[PDB]
Design an enzyme around this catalytic site. Structure first.
Site, PDB file in Angstrom:
ATOM      1  N   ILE A  78       0.804  -1.228   0.000  1.00  0.00           N
ATOM      2  CA  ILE A  78       0.000   0.000   0.000  1.00  0.00           C
ATOM      3  C   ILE A  78       0.829   1.267   0.000  1.00  0.00           C
ATOM      4  CG2 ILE A  78      -2.110  -1.122   1.050  1.00  0.00           C
ATOM      5  CD1 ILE A  78      -1.381  -0.016   3.652  1.00  0.00           C
ATOM      6  N   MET A  87       8.677  -0.224   3.708  1.00  0.00           N
ATOM      7  CA  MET A  87       7.643  -0.669   2.741  1.00  0.00           C
ATOM      8  C   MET A  87       6.405  -1.018   3.565  1.00  0.00           C
ATOM      9  SD  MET A  87       7.522  -3.896   0.162  1.00  0.00           S
ATOM     10  CE  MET A  87       9.020  -4.208   1.092  1.00  0.00           C
ATOM     11  N   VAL A  88       5.256  -0.453   3.213  1.00  0.00           N
ATOM     12  CA  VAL A  88       4.041  -0.664   4.047  1.00  0.00           C
ATOM     13  C   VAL A  88       3.058  -1.554   3.290  1.00  0.00           C
ATOM     14  CG1 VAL A  88       2.186   0.466   5.351  1.00  0.00           C
ATOM     15  CG2 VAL A  88       4.412   1.579   5.145  1.00  0.00           C
ATOM     16  N   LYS A 124       4.565  -2.057   8.540  1.00  0.00           N
ATOM     17  CA  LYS A 124       5.746  -1.373   7.941  1.00  0.00           C
ATOM     18  C   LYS A 124       6.961  -2.264   8.202  1.00  0.00           C
ATOM     19  CE  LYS A 124       7.408   2.765   9.414  1.00  0.00           C
ATOM     20  NZ  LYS A 124       7.489   4.277   9.406  1.00  0.00           N
ATOM     21  N   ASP A 130       8.950  16.588  10.931  1.00  0.00           N
ATOM     22  CA  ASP A 130       8.886  16.175   9.521  1.00  0.00           C
ATOM     23  C   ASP A 130       7.472  16.103   9.005  1.00  0.00           C
ATOM     24  OD1 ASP A 130      10.058  15.586   7.027  1.00  0.00           O
ATOM     25  OD2 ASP A 130       9.929  13.442   7.395  1.00  0.00           O
TER      26      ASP A 130
HETATM   27  N1  LIG Z   1      -0.724   2.903   9.125  1.00  0.00           N
HETATM   28  C1  LIG Z   1      -0.753   3.078   7.808  1.00  0.00           C
HETATM   29  N2  LIG Z   1      -1.902   2.834   7.122  1.00  0.00           N
HETATM   30  C2  LIG Z   1      -1.913   3.016   5.794  1.00  0.00           C
HETATM   31  N3  LIG Z   1      -0.925   3.499   5.012  1.00  0.00           N
HETATM   32  C3  LIG Z   1       0.174   3.766   5.741  1.00  0.00           C
HETATM   33  C4  LIG Z   1       0.337   3.591   7.094  1.00  0.00           C
HETATM   34  N4  LIG Z   1       1.606   3.991   7.499  1.00  0.00           N
HETATM   35  C5  LIG Z   1       2.176   4.363   6.384  1.00  0.00           C
HETATM   36  N5  LIG Z   1       1.371   4.277   5.286  1.00  0.00           N
HETATM   37  C6  LIG Z   1       1.735   4.564   3.919  1.00  0.00           C
HETATM   38  O1  LIG Z   1       3.093   4.216   3.762  1.00  0.00           O
HETATM   39  C7  LIG Z   1       3.877   5.388   3.407  1.00  0.00           C
HETATM   40  C8  LIG Z   1       5.256   5.259   4.025  1.00  0.00           C
HETATM   41  O2  LIG Z   1       5.120   5.385   5.456  1.00  0.00           O
HETATM   42  P1  LIG Z   1       6.182   6.258   6.351  1.00  0.00           P
HETATM   43  O3  LIG Z   1       5.857   5.899   7.754  1.00  0.00           O
HETATM   44  O4  LIG Z   1       6.135   7.735   5.947  1.00  0.00           O
HETATM   45  O5  LIG Z   1       7.546   5.468   5.908  1.00  0.00           O
HETATM   46  P2  LIG Z   1       9.078   5.828   6.133  1.00  0.00           P
HETATM   47  O6  LIG Z   1       9.785   5.241   4.974  1.00  0.00           O
HETATM   48  O7  LIG Z   1       9.527   5.219   7.482  1.00  0.00           O
HETATM   49  N6  LIG Z   1       9.466   7.503   6.311  1.00  0.00           N
HETATM   50  P3  LIG Z   1       9.327   8.579   5.007  1.00  0.00           P
HETATM   51  O8  LIG Z   1      10.431   8.508   3.893  1.00  0.00           O
HETATM   52  O9  LIG Z   1       9.312   9.938   5.706  1.00  0.00           O
HETATM   53  O10 LIG Z   1       7.909   8.349   4.294  1.00  0.00           O
HETATM   54  C9  LIG Z   1       3.022   6.562   3.877  1.00  0.00           C
HETATM   55  O11 LIG Z   1       3.343   7.800   3.210  1.00  0.00           O
HETATM   56  C10 LIG Z   1       1.609   6.058   3.604  1.00  0.00           C
HETATM   57  O12 LIG Z   1       1.077   6.206   2.299  1.00  0.00           O
END
Ligand SMILES: Nc1ncnc2c1ncn2[C@@H]1O[C@H](COP(=O)(O)OP(=O)(O)NP(=O)(O)O)[C@@H](O)[C@H]1O
Ligand SMILES: *[C@@H]1[C@H](C(=O)OC(C)(C)C)C(=O)CC[C@]1(C)C(=O)OCC#C
Length: 337
Positions: free
Chosen positions: A21, A28-29, A44, A139
């Site tokens: 997603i 990767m989520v 995640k 952020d």
């Molecule tokens: N709980 C959740 N439910 C649904 N989608 C989610 C959820 N958490 C994250 N996402 C999706 O996954 C993407 C990546 O999550 P994020 O927590 O921002 O990852 P990151 O790689 O740790 N940090 P960043 O590079 O700042 O995006 C988000 O921008 C959302 O589209």
């Protein structure tokens, strides 16, 4: 182990039916089904241990999100990792499942004024709780503002978060680029102002290519800084840099947003103030007339106590950060302590 786009998701048997997603710079989520609680979740996957900075992000996000409990802040339901530290290479963070994020919604949809006001209200309501815990998110951006089918909004992505104690740069406050020190709750309000502007026009307001271009975007709309503005830049080399730029006139907000509600532009003006000491604070922003249809202090909860990490993380080696991550996630292991 279930596989998603060529990637191991080692989260069974409890979590199954994984679907990609989204993805950021670190994680990767996937959506999944929790067979134990019989609910949809997000998971995640992060693989941080070869990088000290990634380890810091992982520990900060876990520690803060396990201590926060608020409707407008994503919670952590579970954390999966290996039973021994030597086998631990990935961490899986299980969260409530949201449907999309504001970044993706703005790609497809122009928002009405009621939509903008509601989303802005929830951002500030969650931010009121974060700041009341004496924490800076640092952020905020449309991609970490999660949304569900009912338009509920949750802030996520706390890997840069810090206790207050004075990827994309488009939402960074000017003092981050100029001072590199003394960050206050003010930097989050700047981010929220940038987000508001993007909701109003569906385009980012300051889309700089690098820090130098970023400052030129900001100054090309705010205008050259006043004398009082200049005095709040502590790094004198940064002040001299600003003084070397050609003069720039301020652009009126209603030139950029001619059809925007005037109350939204009044609040926007107060959020995108160059001087962080003059910039509106989160409780004052909740009380601004733009949000009058929603503002309810008795239904805007705060944290019982300020947050603290109990150790400085910036200087620890990544192998020590790994041990701290192992310790912090032990509460989700069978047989803990
Ligand atoms: N709980 C959740 N439910 C649904 N989608 C989610 C959820 N958490 C994250 N996402 C999706 O996954 C993407 C990546 O999550 P994020 O927590 O921002 O990852 P990151 O790689 O740790 N940090 P960043 O590079 O700042 O995006 C988000 O921008 C959302 O589209
Ligand atoms: C909320 C939805 C919404 O949350 O988007 C997804 C994609 C998550 C369903 C919209 O953006 C349009 C409808 C709605 C209900 C909304 O904004 O109305 C509330 C008001 C005023």
């Amino acid at each position: 182990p279930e596989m998603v786009r060529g990637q191991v998701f080692d989260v069974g048997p409890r979590y199954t039916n994984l679907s990609y997603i989204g993805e950021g710079a670190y994680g990767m989520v996937c959506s999944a089904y929790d067979n134990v609680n019989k609910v949809r979740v997000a998971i995640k996957k992060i693989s941080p241990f070869e990088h000290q900075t990634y380890c810091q992000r992982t520990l900060r996000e876990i520690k803060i999100l396990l201590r926060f409990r608020h409707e407008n802040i994503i919670g952590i339901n579970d954390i999966i990792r290996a039973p021994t530290i030597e086998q631990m290479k990935d961490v899986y963070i299980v969260q409530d499942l949201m449907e999309t994020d504001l970044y993706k919604l703005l790609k497809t949809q122009h928002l009405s004024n009621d939509h903008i006001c509601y989303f802005l209200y929830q951002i500030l309501r969650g931010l009121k709780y974060i700041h009341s815990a004496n924490v800076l998110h640092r952020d905020l951006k449309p991609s970490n503002l999660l949304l569900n089918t009912t338009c509920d909004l949750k802030i996520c992505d706390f890997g840069l978060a810090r206790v207050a104690d004075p990827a994309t740069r488009w939402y960074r406050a000017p003092e981050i680029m100029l001072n590199s020190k003394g960050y206050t709750k003010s930097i989050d309000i700047w981010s929220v102002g940038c987000i508001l502007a993007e909701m109003l026009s569906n385009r980012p307001i300051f889309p700089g290519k690098h820090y130098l271009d970023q400052l030129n975007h900001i100054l090309g709309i705010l205008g050259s800084p006043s004398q009082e503005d200049l005095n709040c830049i502590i790094n004198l080399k940064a002040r001299n840099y600003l003084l070397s730029l050609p003069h720039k006139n301020k652009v009126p907000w209603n030139r950029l947003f001619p059809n925007a509600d005037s109350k939204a532009l009044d609040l926007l003006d107060k959020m995108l103030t160059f001087n962080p000491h003059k910039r509106i604070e989160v409780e004052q922003a909740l009380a601004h007339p733009y949000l009058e249809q929603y503002y309810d202090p008795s239904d805007e909860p705060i944290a019982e106590a300020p947050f603290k990490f109990d150790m400085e993380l910036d200087d620890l080696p990544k192998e020590k950060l790994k041990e701290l991550i192992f310790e912090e996630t032990a509460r989700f292991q069978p047989g803990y302590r």
